[PDB]
Amino acid sequence: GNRRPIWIMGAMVNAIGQIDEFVNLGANSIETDVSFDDNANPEYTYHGIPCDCGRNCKKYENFNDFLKGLRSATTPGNSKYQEKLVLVVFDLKTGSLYDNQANDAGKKLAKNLLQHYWNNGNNGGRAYIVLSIPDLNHYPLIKGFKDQLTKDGHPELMDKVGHDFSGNDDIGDVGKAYKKAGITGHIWQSDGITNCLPRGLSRVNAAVANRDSANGFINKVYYWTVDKRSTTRDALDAGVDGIMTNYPDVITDVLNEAAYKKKFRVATYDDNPWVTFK
């Protein structure tokens, strides 16, 4: 049948100069860590030590500067525009917040994305955005973010946003969080661990089984962080939609092997990231 569109996602893309570095290696999407200040305002794109094996953990930007950089990379006509870059996952490091600041964090995130990435709707960046929350109890972040875009008069930008819960929670617990949040679509499900440690496919398989079921709630599944060809083959064989990596050219190489090329292709802006593949 049709080839499954795949997001090849550059990992830990936290400096503006890295956006081109990863896209030029074959990434059509990136993941970026977002730190918060004491007031739940996104502050830096910063991970810190420890991080993935082989990487510098300390590159960072003021979050709004990173957004302006991402805006340039994703706005047609800009000197820096990368047509290939279609999705950003923000790994929201809400662990530094109290649980009762989750909703505030979502409003401040929306406020900054509207201002600096979507340019108040004036020729904004065009990538789809996934808000990845590490703790199921921080689900009120989603409400906060939607309510802020609505207050600011741009509720339609929610069409460009989707959701993930990154903490490797049991799939039924994740679904219960989305039911609490009133969310029923635009759901990605991460599964993974640092490239420094081993991991199997059992939870990826559970997530894929949910995605492919008639009654499931997941739209896309992505596996992280994968730096080896054999792991990439295993994940594609398991039917994931996305693979996060420190080496986009490694994943591109596998996808260009003749057996995989018949069955997968690199996602473009044509491909809606909230739609389950069939």
Ligand SMILES: CCCCCCCCCCCCCCCC(=O)O
């Ligand atoms: C930066 C303010 C933008 C507007 C934010 C609207 C939602 C505010 C939620 C309560 C935030 C309380 C802490 C405010 C910290 C600050 O920005 O000075």
Ligand SMILES: CCCCCCCCCCCCC(=O)O
């Ligand atoms: C399984 C984890 C889901 C998130 C925890 C949210 C807090 C639970 C209580 C929220 C209100 C109860 C409800 O709406 O059923």
Ligand SMILES: CCCCCCCC(=O)O
């Ligand atoms: C949040 C989606 C999954 C992202 C993996 C990034 C890991 C990290 O920052 O340690």
Ligand SMILES: [Mg+2]
């Ligand atoms: Mg991260």
